[PDB]
């Protein structure tokens, strides 16, 4: 319990425990030796003043030098370490779990914090496990996300929130689900648009589309494959369009848990949907399950017109082509349906801005 250079009798907890040589040096002589070694000697002369015993020594010594040295003496130690040993700045690591900063100049990918003594990846900063060895980092975090019970317990609700609502005017991203309400209001730029097709909701007398009969009312214009229209389809007919194109869809979970944002006095509070989750709807609302089916339809660019009857084709022609169709002489309902379906799919494309 004596200082190995001055002999001063101090408790062990009141001296500098030099990690490299395990001496016991009082704070005064610790300051004295390393300050003169930097201001008048070379950094290679920074051995222990008691005994006299590489870059992992400087990493452990940097911690003790930060505590006892002066701010300007500590800056001179970085300068000579940079200008004399490394030819560059030292790589300073922050431990994400204990917030301790330390120098790490080793070639290994896993670094151990000198404070909390936990191992983490130098690029990930996630806690290290043997499953990360030999695996890419993106593969590792996606492995922990695929094996988290609380993550998987939410089910398809996490899929609807990943499909973010991007405001087409200000490009702000909202990690939300569309649900049943299609009229979206952006708080950043006040733009009003549909969350399914990203088309504009026009105010009174602001719609420029020709042959529109609701110009004096707030409304938007949606393609035939928008959630605005396909929400009116039954869940059965929606998934038959998926089945007709060999697209899988959930009916069982792998109150509705989809997170919504309600208005509260102190901003916005996250609240689950909590609606009735019928059987065969993957444990979600009817509105959110239909949103889940429509996202699969839009991702594969499935055309709902392939299931249109004759009346539905006449409606789509008057809406998107602004021409009332009429059967030709010699046509039967199949020929009249085939003609309208062909001209509709040739002249009117699907959603040119629907998230796919």
């Amino acid at each position, epitope marked *: 319990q004596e200082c190995a250079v001055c002999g001063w009798a101090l408790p062990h907890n009141r001296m500098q425990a030099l990690t490299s040589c395990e001496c016991t040096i009082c704070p005064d002589c610790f300051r004295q030796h390393f300050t003169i070694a930097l201001k008048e000697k070379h950094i290679t002369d920074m051995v222990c003043p008691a005994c006299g015993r590489l870059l992992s020594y400087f990493s452990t010594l940097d911690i003790q030098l930060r505590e006892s040295l002066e701010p300007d003496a500590y800056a001179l130690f970085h300068k000579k370490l940079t200008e004399g040993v490394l030819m560059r700045d030292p790589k300073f690591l*922050w*431990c*994400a*779990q*204990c*917030s*301790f*900063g330390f120098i790490y100049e080793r070639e290994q990918l896993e670094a151990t914090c000198p*404070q*909390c003594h936990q191992t983490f990846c130098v*690029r*990930c*900063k*996630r806690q290290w496990e043997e499953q990360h060895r030999g695996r890419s980092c993106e593969d590792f975090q996606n492995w922990k996300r695929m094996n988290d019970p*609380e993550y998987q317990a939410q089910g398809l609700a996490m899929y609807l929130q990943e499909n973010g609502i991007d405001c087409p005017k200000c490009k702000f991203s909202y*990690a939300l689900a569309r649900g049943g309400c299609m009229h979206f209001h952006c708080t950043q730029c006040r733009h009003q648009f549909c969350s399914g097709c990203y088309n504009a909701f026009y105010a009174k007398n602001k719609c420029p589309e020709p042959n529109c009969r609701v110009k004096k009312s707030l409304h938007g214009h949606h393609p035939r494959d928008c959630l605005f229209y396909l929400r009116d389809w039954t869940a059965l007919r929606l998934q038959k369009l998926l089945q007709d194109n060999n697209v899988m869809f959930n009916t069982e979970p792998p109150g509705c848990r989809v997170i919504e944002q309600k208005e509260v006095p102190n*901003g916005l509070r*996250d609240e689950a949907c909590g609606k009735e989750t019928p059987a065969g709807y993957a444990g979600l609302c009817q509105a959110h399950y239909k949103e889940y089916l429509v996202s699969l339809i839009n991702a594969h660019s499935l055309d709902p017109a392939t299931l249109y009857e004759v009346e539905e084709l006449e409606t789509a022609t008057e809406r998107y082509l602004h021409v009332r169709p009429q059967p030709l002489a010699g046509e039967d309902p199949p020929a009249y349906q085939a003609r309208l379906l062909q001209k509709l799919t040739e002249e009117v494309p699907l959603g040119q801005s629907i998230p796919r």
Partner: nanobody
Amino acid sequence: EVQLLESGGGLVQPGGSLRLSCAASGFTFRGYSMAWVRQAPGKGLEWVSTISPIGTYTYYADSVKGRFTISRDNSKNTLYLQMNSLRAEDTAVYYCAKGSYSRGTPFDYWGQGTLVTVS
């Protein structure tokens, strides 16, 4: 996205007790460690304490260890800081901090802060 809101600051007599809170949203609270930091008047920012993502490990600065107690409620995405036997040197703006896994910073988000004054 990320939002950290502090609460509980105010004027406290010396030797008094105070409890700060931090309401977190916009990220998975249970997946990151949280920390409290403070800045005394006219001084540099000083780290107070840090709690592990699920709460098994707690770290403290030497001047507040045993006097302050950090805790979190992942069920409610809330960080807490119980401060006992407050001294005049505890007067500072106390900031809630969210830990980060991005290179070059131990924290990527800080809150608005709450002012704590010790008479």
